[PDB]
Design a protein around this ligand. Structure first.
Ligand code: NA
Lengths: 87, 87
């Protein structure tokens, strides 16, 4: 699992759309969908209700989502601070 | 930046060796070294003292290291708990 998977997943959850998330991340929809599938397959879980319109998380999916946003925020803080040290 | 970069970096810092870190991560040394260089180049900073034997972090490198281990621990906790929900 990579940060890309988390960033893609968060965008899908927030936009409630695979296409709209793809637009926001400046990528095509098909690879985005494949990456989220890859994430679910790696974890051995369903993060999203399959076939849900608009896109809705499963309970474990929403749990994962809430911790994913926390982690991505921490990444941003880490990178920002480390850069500020060197400059 | 991806989780791979953090995992590679942490291993190098802890083993104080590019080769020994590669052994631990079950990969060849050359791609490992390239990935760490890629990480430093992306951030625009030196995480390791260039030419140091044994491998030693820069002050910003050690700072980054300490937050990287925290983040990787959080990733592990997130994945473990989310899996435990679905099972
Ligand atoms: Na990653």
């Amino acid at each position: 699992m990579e940060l890309r998977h988390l960033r893609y997943f968060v965008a899908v959850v927030e936009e409630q759309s695979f296409t709209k998330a793809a637009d926001k991340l400046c990528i095509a929809q098909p690879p985005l969908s494949r990456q989220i599938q890859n994430l679910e397959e790696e974890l051995g879980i369903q993060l999203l209700e399959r076939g849900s319109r608009p896109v809705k998380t499963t309970p474990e999916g929403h749990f994962f989502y809430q911790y994913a946003i926390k982690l991505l925020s921490n990444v941003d803080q880490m990178v920002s601070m480390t850069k500020r040290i060197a400059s």
